[PDB]
Amino acid sequence: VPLDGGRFATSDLNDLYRRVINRNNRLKRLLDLAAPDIIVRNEKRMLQEAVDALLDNGRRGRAITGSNKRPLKSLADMIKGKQGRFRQNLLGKRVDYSGRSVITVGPYLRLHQCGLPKKMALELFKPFIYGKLELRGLATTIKAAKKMVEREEAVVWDILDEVIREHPVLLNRAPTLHRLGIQAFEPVLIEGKAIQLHPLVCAAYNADFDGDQMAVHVPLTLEAQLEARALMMSTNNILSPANGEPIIVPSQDVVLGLYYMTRDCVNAKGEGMVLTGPKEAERLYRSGLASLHARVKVRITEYEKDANGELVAKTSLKDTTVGRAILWMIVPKGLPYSIVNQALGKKAISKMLNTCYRILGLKPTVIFADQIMYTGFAYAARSGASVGIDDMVIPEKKHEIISEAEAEVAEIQEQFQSGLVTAGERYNKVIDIWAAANDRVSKAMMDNLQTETVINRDGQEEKQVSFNSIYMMADSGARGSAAQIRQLAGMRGLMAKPDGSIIETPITANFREGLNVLQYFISTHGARKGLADTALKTANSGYLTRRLVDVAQDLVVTEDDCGTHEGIMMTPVIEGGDVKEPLRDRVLGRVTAEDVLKPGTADILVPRNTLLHEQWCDLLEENSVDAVKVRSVVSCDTDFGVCAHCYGRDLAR
Amino acid sequence: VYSYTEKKRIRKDFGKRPQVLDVPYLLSIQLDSFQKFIEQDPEGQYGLEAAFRSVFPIQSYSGNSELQYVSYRLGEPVFDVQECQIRGVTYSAPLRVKLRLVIYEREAPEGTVKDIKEQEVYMGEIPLMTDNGTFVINGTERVIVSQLHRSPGVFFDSDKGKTHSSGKVLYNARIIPYRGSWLDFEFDPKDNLFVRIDRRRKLPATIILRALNYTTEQILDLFFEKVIFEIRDNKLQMELVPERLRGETASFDIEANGKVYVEKGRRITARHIRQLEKDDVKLIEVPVEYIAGKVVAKDYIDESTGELICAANMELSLDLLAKLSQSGHKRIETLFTNDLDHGPYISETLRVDPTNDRLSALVEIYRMMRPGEPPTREAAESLFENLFFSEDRYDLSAVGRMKFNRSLLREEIEGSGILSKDDIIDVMKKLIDIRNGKGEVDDIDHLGNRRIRSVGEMAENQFRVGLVRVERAVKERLSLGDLDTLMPQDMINAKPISAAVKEFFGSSQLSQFMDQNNPLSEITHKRRISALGPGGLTRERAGFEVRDVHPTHYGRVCPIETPEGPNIGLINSLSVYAQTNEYGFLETPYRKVTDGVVTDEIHYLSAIEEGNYVIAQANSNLDEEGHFVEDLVTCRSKGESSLFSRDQVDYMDVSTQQVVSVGASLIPFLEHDDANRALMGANMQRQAVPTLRADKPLVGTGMERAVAVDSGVTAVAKRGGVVQYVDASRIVIKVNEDEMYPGEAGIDIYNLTKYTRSNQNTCINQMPCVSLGEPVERGDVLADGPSTDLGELALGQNMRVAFMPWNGYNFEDSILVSERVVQEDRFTTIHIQELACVSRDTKLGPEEITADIPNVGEAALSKLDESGIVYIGAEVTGGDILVGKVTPKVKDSSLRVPNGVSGTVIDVQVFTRDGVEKDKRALEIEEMQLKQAKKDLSEELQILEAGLFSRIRAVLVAGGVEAEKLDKLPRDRWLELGLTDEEKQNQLEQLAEQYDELKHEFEKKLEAKRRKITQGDDLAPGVLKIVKVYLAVKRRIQPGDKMAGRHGNKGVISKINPIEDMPYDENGTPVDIVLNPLGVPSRMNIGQILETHLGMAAKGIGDKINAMLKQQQEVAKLREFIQRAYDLGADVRQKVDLSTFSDEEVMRLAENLRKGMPIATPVFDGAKEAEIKELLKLGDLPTSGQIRLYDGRTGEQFERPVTVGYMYMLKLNHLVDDKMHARSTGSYSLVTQQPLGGKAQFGGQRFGEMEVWALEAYGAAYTLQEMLTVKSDDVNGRTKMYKNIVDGNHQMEPGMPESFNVLLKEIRSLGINIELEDE
DNA sequence: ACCCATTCAGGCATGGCTAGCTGC
DNA sequence: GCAGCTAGCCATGCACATCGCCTGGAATGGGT
RNA sequence: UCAGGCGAUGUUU
Ligand SMILES: [Mg+2]
Ligand SMILES: [Zn+2]
């Protein structure tokens, strides 16, 4: 190549060929004059080793140096390795029609559509644009229309909308660990320069918004559009092929919302008044007569589909809370009202979404997810759940507890100083007693938080669960847990030392009060251990996934029924301790192999070629048979593939 | 008391401990190191003096012609720093050396024939160090990062466990010399000792023993003890050291002169041994049929015949006993051997020996060091005597010798710089001692086995490499030379010296491209301590222990400030108080404790010294009298903390900061944060970017002043005095009287640096921060720099924040910002790009820079002058034409603003190689720069000459004045005066002669300056003139930028609301940012809430003063209120007697407080909740720190209080319009017809291996077949696809990927044959 | 002399192998 | 006095995208 | 438009 100016960047090939060719010409020469044998042997040996270089430098003892200081790249290196063709331009390659940018939030999107920048789009779809232009005749040829788009005149944006209208794109996030990390969307055009991405999918991508980036690809051909519309648009992956558990699991803000939205206090404005329907419950909460969570009676009407596909209504006076009804105005038709009566933590809201799925199908579930999100964000903000120093409460007994523990420490110290115990059990004694004190303080703080609020009922006093913002964000399951709320209020326990031994003086102080220096400095290597670990962890795991996919590649479900009577056996796992995995969830959805006889023999309970779904598992529980044979892919008897029935349910459908 | 600028805005300071040792000068590492590398110092000892005096004298092959050293010198540079950056040459210095060449009388005693001393042969250029610690290599500004490696010395490691699975441990012992060849000893699971050299193979250790000309008998004597047997009456009675039995259970009777102590079989008790040693009874009879299971000491040949009886170190048997008792060797010596205390290790290894003599040993060594050669005897002799004993190719330093003798419990600390028999043997003894069960392995993290080099060490060493590369050639020419017909400066050729030292300062795993976007970034990057680079471990071998933080980092190397990701734990920053010991171990301050009093006597300590003493801790309540107020205290003793008695302590910490680096001691309330988030906070702080309008930080930590002043990015005054002329360009200070030199001194002049490029494309800029007619003290600011204010560090801005979830727009971490922010331009950064346009005269012709262009008319050419280059000022955009360049045909090789990058041209440079013309605009800018140089340097000298006329007319005035004799005539009548003929007339006459000389001097100076500015310096070969243009974008803030606190809460700004819709509070002010509370519990950084509350208190004090001052109130009220605010707090060291300012001097202070009374918080001695509350209540805000906020949309109270306050946020520099990118179709690559990669090159993404797996997982296959055929590789199909697209039909045509076709051609180029079959 | 003739050290795991290596 | 074993020596490999920024063939010796 | 260095980025649970 002609680099900047006149010089030419030497290419290792050109170099090595040039060397072998010089060597060869000299050797032809010396065989035109019958020169002596020592010389010809030297020449031949040099030539052999130069060709060795050309083919595979570095393999014969010491490599030949490069033009500067460093081995130069031969053909074998041009094939193999992390940077040869097979891994740099065949398996995965670069791609026109694409772009990349930063992501942001945009919580106004139905979950089957994503933001997309304007500039970035008009630069993506330039072809389809040229088309529609000279179709409407607003131009002459390519070059004229190219001037058009360059100008960005008043028409191009309208036509850009016209071709966006329905045309899926693919969003992708950089380290794509697994299938769900490439999905589809329909574009909505936006100003700015940041891809706006629906929020119920951040979980799947594993994409916080601390400055991550996403790539957009366009599908061109018609088959491909139908692809992104039938196999990859977010409304067709609401089960993870890993394990059939939902993946649209709502997340932090939205659950804090619903939570604070549905939870009884004991005495707020509007007590005991009776209401004629979710509608006027909402109308109260708006004009400000009743409060968002006040024990109340209402008339609600629920539908149940007991008939063979028919929806029967029934009404009654439930006892509930205003906010809880206002939630009810969303839930689709056929779900029992007892689904939103309880506190609505994170687990519970997931349960709600999933039952809605199993019963009403798909479209209701998607639309109901989007409404969860809207109403959630809305009432969260309308709550205003902050966090401030005054809301991390110190147990007033912490000082006493820890002083008492200190005294016991000193007592063991004396029993050793007079020489009555071995350092071994001394060490063990101290560590145990600190652990005990730790647990006592943790009990104390958790108590004083959870019951803190104590208020009057139009009577005298009464105690209820609290409204302490940090306790709330930890009881909803939004963020944190008992562990971390502990580390904010009560002592933060014992901290390891680099080796694995465990230092014998706990960090008596929490994060609200300060930390004197030495305490902090221990906590350091406590944390750096893991933080430095995580990187090497990443690398090695990537390598693992690679090898796995390169051994399980060819395997495609080809035939339909191998028709065999082998199989493996299934019993629930028991590890000396309590049973760990129930036989139900090890046998959910996996074709049986031999008819499972009722323990009363000659009482055939199930056929041999059934598809054990939930109800059949229930039957198994009924007769309580607990050793079932079943067909497993390791036994199927099909050439060059794997028969359908031997592979069971397809999780994600 | 206060330095007169502090009296402007005196920062209030919580904090309880008295500080005794102020923050030291933050660049000691760099500055002392280089000042040491390059400085005339006698007696060798670490300088170029050391280097030369080592390598010289050079003597011929006994030809009695010799070359020797004298001295050396360093001329002043051929430029200065600023001109140097602007042009591009290095900031170098010439190197002169005085050499002396002598020859003795041929064929005679030492008759000195001749000694010519070539005056200062020139041997190259070595860069210098700017007063900021940065080198300047090619127009850019680079930094060398101190390296951390293993102390040249000796070591005893375990490698416990993991090897051989046998549960058995090894014990290897290494010698790592400073320069030469390593050496290792190690065991093997059969207790067999083995030496190895340079990691090559294994050898039986006794081989190198014997190689050091030792006979087997000497060897056994040296290692093992002895056991004496006599052929007495019978049974050959034995001498017995009683202790020698305690480990060995007996199998025969144990008596004493018949008096039996034990009978056959049992072990021995120490009581018995004591009895025996009391008895002295040792010469005892032994069962003879037992000793046969032992080993002989020496060779007992016959007294008479001397036959081949017994080889030393051989087993025994009664037949051999008789074979020797034939002559009756009445003395037999054997080797004491325990199998628990003292083992037969060396004996067994000696048995495994292949060789038996010195010569064979040397042969074996030669053969392992060189594969495949018949060894010549003396050749191998040379090879061995040249690896471990020759001054040339092996060298410990003083450092090595110290650490070595220390490890061996030797006496001294000085000694030779090469090994010795004594040494190798002693090492082996120590190793054996370990395997026996005394002593302990060291470890390789303890900071007594790990050491800091620096720029000095490096450059010195590389320069030494230079000298040896030159001495070989010099010695050659001298050997093949002749009689003095050539002077010295022709022997030596400097090109190798220069080339090597340039290789170093220009291309190293160390010398790197200084981060510069930010004061704090400079001052971190210069204090960095890397473990990489030559002589160090690398990012794929480092295990886990070097990455963990060993418990001697305390107070020497930060725990927290460090990158995350690949190279964690290898880029240790360096603590505040840290210093470098004499030898080079990190050492820290401490306070000396006598019997019961905490002195104020500082005292430095290294790593290992600290082990023995017992150390206090920073925050230990001591009371007024050097007494700890308690009687038992927390302390740390030997990598262990505990509680100790009041009387055992010896040393107390210095201050409370010393455990962290200046990376993360700017983090208010640090101690309320998890290590993790403090870490990410330190880093993001390092990546700030100067804003447009700097602003003090409302909640700082008293280190801002240090970082700012003691970095180099602000104009500090050098001599106290009075300002005389201010301007955005320069500041001119009239020095005071006494600080002035006696001789015609004058005044001082600082050239502030107006807008110019930084190495990260951000802007750098300076502003005056003092007004006309005003005092300044020595050592003081006179110009804020990028991200500074009145001399404090200021990275971001303080905005009013409110924590509450708000309609989803702040979902994960997405800050939401109100248009008030973007309107007032308080994040509007400034950037600058530097394009380029060069011109080489080539074959086929030259290249002029005219403005003549086909395909476009004046409609585009307008913005160019008739000379071609762009006017300074035109708002250019993407596609405009900055320079008109033409190439001989004519072909257009012009220069255009690349797409996207807006601009506004601010400056144009033009270089030209000396020997070419200067075209029209060259001439224009040329004479402009002449006028510039004139009105700059000449005009400088003109105000200087004005002040000088004042000084010498005062020589005519002050004293025996001529008032009327002098006011009439202008200031020109001074030379030939006849006045009082005393010292005043003498001064007149002689100094006026001197002054006409000074007129000539003025002239010659200016002429030299013109001469410089006229010379057209060097370029790349083959180029004529270079034109450079600069542009200045200006970036606002917009959905996508990454904002960040100081506590490690990142966040991508995600919408820009109108003012109506923020949450406003009952008094009307909106709130400017809205974060997300859910982010506090999990990431357990409860710190940012305390920051917020204290901030709100600050702005409370502010608004109060603001009102009091707007009402135009009297001053009594202000003194009272300000006084109160500075006085509250429990018991602080701050103490301002506000009643000693001038009434005017207060109104000014209020003027600078009305934005908010800044507050301190020394890192680990912060402000407590109690004092935060009391400060708020001094204000008028609610104690809890939570307000009620309404809501811009519905105007109805949020249902419970929220937290609002002020917080200091920073605009990190991953600007979104730098990230975003798109591509439809464009440049394709060349070898494999795929698209390119990157942004500049208009490329596309990388549909990588993992994405392809994903697509395969979905059933989709057309998407994949497409993205591997049409979007990328098939040429034919690619174009046909595009065509169908524009026609309205969507359909593809697969074809075959050209890259695969390439794979075919290459494999086919090998011998292999690869085809495509047929169907 | 200038731009071109002929040439120039902190792995670890495993595994796969080669050369002794002492049961027989 | 041959063969299964055991011990040293070399081959192989060790995440994915960015983005920058630089930095980059001479090396003697020759003919006008 | 081709190969090394560095740094950053992100992958924090
Ligand atoms: Mg992230
Ligand atoms: Zn099957």
Side-chain angles (χ1 to χ4, degrees), chain B residues 512 539 563 677 686-687 1042 1050 1229-1230 1241:
Chain B
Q512 57 192 3
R539 288 181 291 176
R677 296 297 182 182
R686 185 177 68 242
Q687 286 174 354
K1042 179 193 288 187
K1050 298 186 177 182
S1229 173
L1230 200 146
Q1241 302 160 352

Side-chain angles (χ1 to χ4, degrees), chain B residues 94-274:
Chain B
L95 181 61
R96 308 288 186 184
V97 171
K98 286 183 181 291
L99 294 175
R100 186 176 293 168
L101 178 57
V102 298
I103 300 169
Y104 293 98
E105 187 179 1
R106 290 178 180 174
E107 195 264 330
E110 58 275 13
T112 66
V113 174
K114 181 68 175 178
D115 54 352
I116 63 169
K117 293 188 289 185
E118 174 64 28
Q119 291 183 357
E120 64 178 2
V121 60
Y122 163 78
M123 63 176 71
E125 293 178 351
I126 55 170
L128 294 177
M129 182 174 287
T130 311
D131 284 332
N132 292 325
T134 69
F135 293 91
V136 180
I137 294 299
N138 291 319
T140 62
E141 186 171 1
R142 298 168 73 90
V143 173
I144 285 89
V145 178
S146 295
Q147 188 186 12
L148 184 63
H149 68 279
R150 292 188 67 185
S151 169
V154 63
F155 289 97
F156 297 101
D157 183 81
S158 171
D159 291 330
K160 69 184 77 65
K162 306 302 291 182
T163 60
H164 295 85
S165 68
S166 300
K168 184 176 175 66
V169 297
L170 302 177
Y171 289 104
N172 57 1
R174 305 181 68 180
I175 291 175
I176 306 170
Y178 187 79
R179 178 176 61 91
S181 301
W182 290 352
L183 189 64
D184 293 335
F185 297 164
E186 60 185 0
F187 288 115
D188 284 335
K190 289 173 68 176
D191 283 332
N192 295 319
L193 193 61
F194 289 101
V195 63
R196 72 175 64 190
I197 299 174
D198 293 336
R199 303 293 299 162
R200 285 186 182 274
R201 287 192 297 161
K202 189 182 290 185
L203 291 183
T206 63
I207 186 169
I208 191 166
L209 281 176
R210 194 178 293 274
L212 292 178
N213 191 0
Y214 279 173
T215 62
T216 296
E217 183 176 0
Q218 292 176 355
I219 294 171
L220 294 174
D221 187 0
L222 200 153
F223 287 180
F224 296 104
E225 297 179 357
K226 296 294 183 181
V227 174
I228 298 298
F229 295 100
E230 297 186 355
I231 301 172
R232 298 189 63 80
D233 188 3
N234 191 358
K235 301 291 180 68
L236 279 70
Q237 289 191 356
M238 176 187 169
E239 295 182 352
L240 284 81
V241 175
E243 299 177 355
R244 293 183 184 177
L245 303 178
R246 65 182 177 88
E248 294 183 355
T249 300
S251 177
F252 59 94
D253 182 74
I254 298 166
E255 66 180 3
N257 190 2
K259 181 178 183 290
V260 174
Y261 288 90
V262 174
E263 291 185 355
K264 174 164 69 176
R266 294 292 183 269
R267 70 169 181 84
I268 296 89
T269 67
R271 292 184 179 180
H272 299 168
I273 294 173
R274 293 182 181 92

Side-chain angles (χ1 to χ4, degrees), chain A residues 562 631 636-637 643 646:
Chain A
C562 67
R631 297 178 64 185
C636 172
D637 193 359
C643 68
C646 287

Side-chain angles (χ1 to χ4, degrees), chain A residues 50 157 201 271 326 589:
Chain A
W157 303 112
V201 183
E271 175 64 25
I326 290 172

